[PDB]
Design a protein around this ligand. Structure first.
Ligand SMILES: [Ca+2]
Lengths: 223, 5
């Protein structure tokens, strides 16, 4: 997260870190056994780290739970990043508590201008790399589809939205992928992609979770 | 560009 702020430990209790011996993506806990992340975060060997704040220090409240299933959306296109959503089933249900909590899926899509919280342990620099220890947060609005498509012509599918800032300086960034964009208590987005990070006129692009709620529910229900 | 590490 570039241009964000330290969330505060466990203030984003649905934020998970996907770890493969290092934090590589975020995710969002959507129930005690399932995490939503980005399909492009798929890999083997995912350990979901819940309850994290400092991802480099065991501070307490962490639960590290292996992924038992990582379900990339069947129509994920790794070139266009359409359907950039993955569900991870935890090998065991997380113990939910104030620091490890699910986030609700949307019941409807969010409108442009909806303010959301994007969080992650991604790079905090728009140029160069600095990976934080602690979870970073960014309040960011969903941009209009027109602005999003203007920023990323031909690249924004109906399953994506832009959020953030066009003036630069505030965005999700590498290492934030898969993590949440939560708006009014609903997981509306998954950090997916963008042209660089926090670049002027290049807002973050996020998987539009509301388009996947049924898929998520159906997939969870069948797994 | 995807935002993974
Ligand atoms: Ca930790």
């Amino acid at each position: 997260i570039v241009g964000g702020y330290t969330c505060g430990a466990n203030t984003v209790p649905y934020q998970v870190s996907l770890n493969s011996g290092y934090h590589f993506c975020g995710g969002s806990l959507i129930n005690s056994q399932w995490v939503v992340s980005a399909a492009h975060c798929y890999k083997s060997g995912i350990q979901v780290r819940l309850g994290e704040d400092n991802i480099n220090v065991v501070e307490g409240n962490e639960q590290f739970i292996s992924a038992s299933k990582s379900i990339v959306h069947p129509s994920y296109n790794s070139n266009t990043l359409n359907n950039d959503i993955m569900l991870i089933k935890l090998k065991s249900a997380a113990s939910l508590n104030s620091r490890v909590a699910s986030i609700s899926l949307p019941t409807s899509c969010a409108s442009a201008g909806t303010q959301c919280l994007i969080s992650g342990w991604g790079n905090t620099k728009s140029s160069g790399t600095s990976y934080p220890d602690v979870l970073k947060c960014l309040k960011a609005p969903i941009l209009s589809d027109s602005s999003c498509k203007s920023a990323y012509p031909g690249q924004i599918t109906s399953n994506m939205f832009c959020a953030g800032y066009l003036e630069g300086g505030k965005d999700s960034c590498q290492g934030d992928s898969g993590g949440p964009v939560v708006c009014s208590g609903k997981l509306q987005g998954i950090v997916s992609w963008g042209s660089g990070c926090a670049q002027k006129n290049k807002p973050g692009v996020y998987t539009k979770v509301c388009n996947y709620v049924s898929w998520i529910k159906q997939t969870i229900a069948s797994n | 560009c995807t935002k993974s590490i």
